[PDB]
Design a binder for these strands. Sequence first.
RNA 1: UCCGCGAUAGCUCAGUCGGUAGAGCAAAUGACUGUUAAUCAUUGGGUCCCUGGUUCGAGUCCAGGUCGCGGAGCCA
RNA 2: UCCGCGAUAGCUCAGUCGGUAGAGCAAAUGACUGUUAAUCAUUGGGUCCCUGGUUCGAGUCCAGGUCGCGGAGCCA
Lengths: 585, 585
Amino acid sequence: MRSHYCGQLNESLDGQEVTLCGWVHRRRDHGGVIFLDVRDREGLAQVVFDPDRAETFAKADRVRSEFVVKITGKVRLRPEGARNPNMASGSIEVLGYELEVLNQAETPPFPLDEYSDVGEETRLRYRFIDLRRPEMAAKLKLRARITSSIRRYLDDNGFLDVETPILGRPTPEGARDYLVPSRTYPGHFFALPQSPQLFKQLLMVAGFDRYYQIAKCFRDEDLRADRQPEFTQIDIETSFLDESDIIGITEKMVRQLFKEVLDVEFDEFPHMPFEEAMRRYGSDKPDLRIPLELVDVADQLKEVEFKVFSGPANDPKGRVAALRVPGAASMPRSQIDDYTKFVGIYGAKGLAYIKVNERAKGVEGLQSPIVKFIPEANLNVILDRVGAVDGDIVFFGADKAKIVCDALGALRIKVGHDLKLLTREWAPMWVVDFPMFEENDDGSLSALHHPFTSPKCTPAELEANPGAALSRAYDMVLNGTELGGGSIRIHDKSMQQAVFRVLGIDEAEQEEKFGFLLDALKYGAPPHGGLAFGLDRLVMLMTGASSIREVIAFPKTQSAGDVMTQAPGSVDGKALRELHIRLRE
Amino acid sequence: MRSHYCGQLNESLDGQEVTLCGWVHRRRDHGGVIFLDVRDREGLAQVVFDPDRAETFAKADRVRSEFVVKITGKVRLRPEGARNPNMASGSIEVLGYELEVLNQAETPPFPLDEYSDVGEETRLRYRFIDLRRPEMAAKLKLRARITSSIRRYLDDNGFLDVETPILGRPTPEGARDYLVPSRTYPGHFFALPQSPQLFKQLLMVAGFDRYYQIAKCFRDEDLRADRQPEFTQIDIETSFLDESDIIGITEKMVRQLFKEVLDVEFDEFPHMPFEEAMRRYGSDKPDLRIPLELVDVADQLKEVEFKVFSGPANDPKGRVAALRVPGAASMPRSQIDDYTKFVGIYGAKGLAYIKVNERAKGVEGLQSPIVKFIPEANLNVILDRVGAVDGDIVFFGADKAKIVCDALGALRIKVGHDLKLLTREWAPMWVVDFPMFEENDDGSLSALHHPFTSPKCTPAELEANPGAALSRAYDMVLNGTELGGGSIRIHDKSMQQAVFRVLGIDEAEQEEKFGFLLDALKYGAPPHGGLAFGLDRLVMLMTGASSIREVIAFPKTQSAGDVMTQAPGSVDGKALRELHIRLRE
RNA sequence: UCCGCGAUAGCUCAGUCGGUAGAGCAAAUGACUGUUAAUCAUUGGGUCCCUGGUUCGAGUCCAGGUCGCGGAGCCA
RNA sequence: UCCGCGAUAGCUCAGUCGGUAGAGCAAAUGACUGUUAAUCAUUGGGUCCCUGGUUCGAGUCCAGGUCGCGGAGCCA
Ligand SMILES: N[C@@H](CC(=O)O)C(=O)O
Ligand SMILES: N[C@@H](CC(=O)O)C(=O)O
């Protein structure tokens, strides 16, 4: 039916006649000559109409925006003073022999025009015309191209595209599970998976050497800019491989992927320990595009008159880190206050600062209310260590380790972006050597990866001082965002029971919830380790998108609702009763 | 860590030493020589041990079934009288230099041996060792290879791998939807999709010319041998194409797929109308491997003494079809009774028959209680038309059209398999020219495809006598099973509202449930049509599997439960209350 | 919801007439240099799906219930 | 659950001091042979998120509620 795509009309097609189908982007009427910009998946082309055939002209005057039309005409090499740079087929035209309106179109709620600041609620309510926009279309086509490349790579390296079930068993240890009432088992529920974890491990026990799957995952947690309740994840699991082999394969994949699509190269991936990343960046996912760095300085603030410093400086559970931000002594007190509230949202009691103006003048030349409570010597070697000179300002996080790490960690990236201090485009890295556990506002512990992660120690050295236990885990970080990660799994069962005990799971749940896991571990489980990628975030980075919603066909709002389909919706009492449940108002 | 896979040890590797990791399939102990059959993803190999290195021997005597071991040895060209035909590396051996037990294994509940009639409940409860069996593994690897080929094809033809959301809006027209309580919208529910239908259509409106997706689909309906509650489906949708183009592309895909994997060719796909398929096979999915055929014969039974024949023979709403099954006059009355009950389960009041023994002897020579109520002439031309001779038997379905179609339709395939009358291996075909609607035990109508299917007539000729309306639908059938199908969609909105009205959906639901559809249709929807494949059934056919559960990693039971993970399970009252619901006992 | 079949050792299953528990395989131990579904011997192993009822007595009979398989309904 | 920002024509938004509704764009109509974000003119277009309360009077003020965005909690 169609001869060629509009956005694929080259100069070589001159003289030839073409039949193209598509939408009417915009129409320009001069009376004696009518212009149409016809759009399809490949781009836009221009069709011109003269009244020598007044019927086609009549079918050109009635045509409005976003009409679905089929045009047959001749490819005319357009004049030199009429060539369009933006249009890929802008050095060419089509004289319209015959036009047909395949379908009419009502006026599009928002324009598909250059720089129209719609308007995300409206773009989501009419997502089916929002994706008409070449930008969105390019993003989605890019996502498809990406998954194409990844699938190709993983297939070429002996991985098996295996599907794992969505309807699974509900357990109360991981993230909040979406529940599905069972019609056949009243009082029981299915649960949507956060990850095909247990299943992929079983597939390793099953003898499949290498498994991969681009799988749907579901978390009933609240949303954020890079977090959706329903997210697609690139699952990978292998047998008889250590962490070096795994990070090797996955890194190789990411490199090949970035070279196939964006055609970029990454030099090398720095392996950074968790401790270091927390020490000098205050984040488990450092943004290495920002040269700003946290520097410990509490060693010089032990016997100082200022008490909010010497407090945690002598407290082993906390620290006092400094943060030099350059040329910013000229900061208005307004901005300082904004930053103090900002570090406030992460738990910081306040935000001490030192404005450096003249270091040659000693204590004076250092504008700050704090400069009085700190001796000149300590002060000077602090400014020396932090690398500050005239014009800079040094912020201070002095509190519990977690608090200063989080507050200065976030302040770092914030003032990093606010001053545009990004030093490179792509900053890939590996965060390695994690702790095995962490405590959550309470004596309760939780694995910072997942309870199936292999510890470095033995099952005896684990239930004794679990805090000194390291995990065989590893995360991949790109431009401050977590591309993904994984770990080497437990296969000793005894060990698995050890970490299950230390996490508060007694043998009741061990048998009832994770019984099949222990079983599979006892019936000959091989050394296996894996990794997962957040496909959504990956595409968000590769496109350069602001939000995850920009790289998802039909995303959801912060309340996990879809404005286009009005989901979630109401269900009649019949189907509700059939699932053996009642509501409550 | 591993040098080579066990099942990839060729003769060329002779002399070379290899390190292979895997499971211990079975062990044979002769005392002075120990034999191990080591298995991995590629197959089995044999490792031999002599006591000249008694430590490795000690690590060979302790080893039992399904132990996870790593063996380093030398590839020895085994003697001629010891070569194994079944084993791919059976003309070779490995003398074990050093062995290491990577992990021990408890005795496998069922054996992984040749012809052990386990035992599907046990195979499902321990699915992680069931998939160790080379057969299951081969099935899954085949499935992966299939999806690989399909993805490759569709990608090569300008289709876009786009993901559609799982959490959608609940509607009460299609199949029973699985519901998901909303934590943020109390009293409202999400619903798992039966198909990405509306979404794929929106993606057609969105300007993406060609879309495909291997998507998860969910139906809360009871199960069968080829029906699961959670099934994977190959979704396809295109714009600006008619049914001929679509059936062309999809058929081309299936051909290429069958040639890439099984390396078979299909001659041509016969296009059979719905009416014909129902007339001479009594099924919308004919098994063309069975030469047995239904033949209308009611025209000869108008004024006959037998009343169960002449009843429906004069009734326009019903018919009298005959079914000749050859050489089966020798059938025991037991088998006849079994068949009568069998056609009984499909609504047939009974099952009249004629045993043909001697046609030269006239009415006698025809053993039957019915032969008395039917004149000799009519009888004889019936036997002539049905093609019966001495030794054959002719069954009769005389009832309402639906009843005889279903009962004889099923009897046909049953006696087709029971007598092994399969004439070819692959019988591909297209069933085309469906009716638009059908009534369900009630004045209520339902589209036999789906309410978005394009009718052949106009929106006026549709609300008037809807029974004379044909759909632009098409199904692909292989060996009697439905591989899939699709149709050309509605884009007139007026038409969509017409079929929505005739299906009992008032403008209330039209606005509330399918509002976004009508909207998208009004804002410039192109002529689009699509198709979907049941990937599960496809793999079931290509493998030659008995059940769908054989080609699914972790399938479910007839009550939609998983015996391995004990799903569905119970959830604590906290998470239950958080989703704003209560149970009832 | 309906029809039909089924549940006994780790696995496949027999178990009569209602009379108080068996085989093969597997496992553990033993012997053996060439088997490849190794052979051979010794030994261990029971919530007869659950719950009740009739019996002096229940794997066996009755009733209800649970689970697994095929089908009908259902599967736009 | 908490912090912050936000809702006015189809779209982007102004709306003062509480005084009874506006712009640009879009649409419909008109003119024009060369524009490419065409130009120009005429005309149409309001559930000021919802619900109440104070006022002679509410887009404006108060209270509760709904929705959308960023973040905290949360996200094994
Ligand atoms: N599924 C894990 C990663 C893995 O175990 O591979 C996660 O999402 O953190
Ligand atoms: N999704 C439809 C087929 C299609 O519309 O393509 C079905 O399952 O019957």
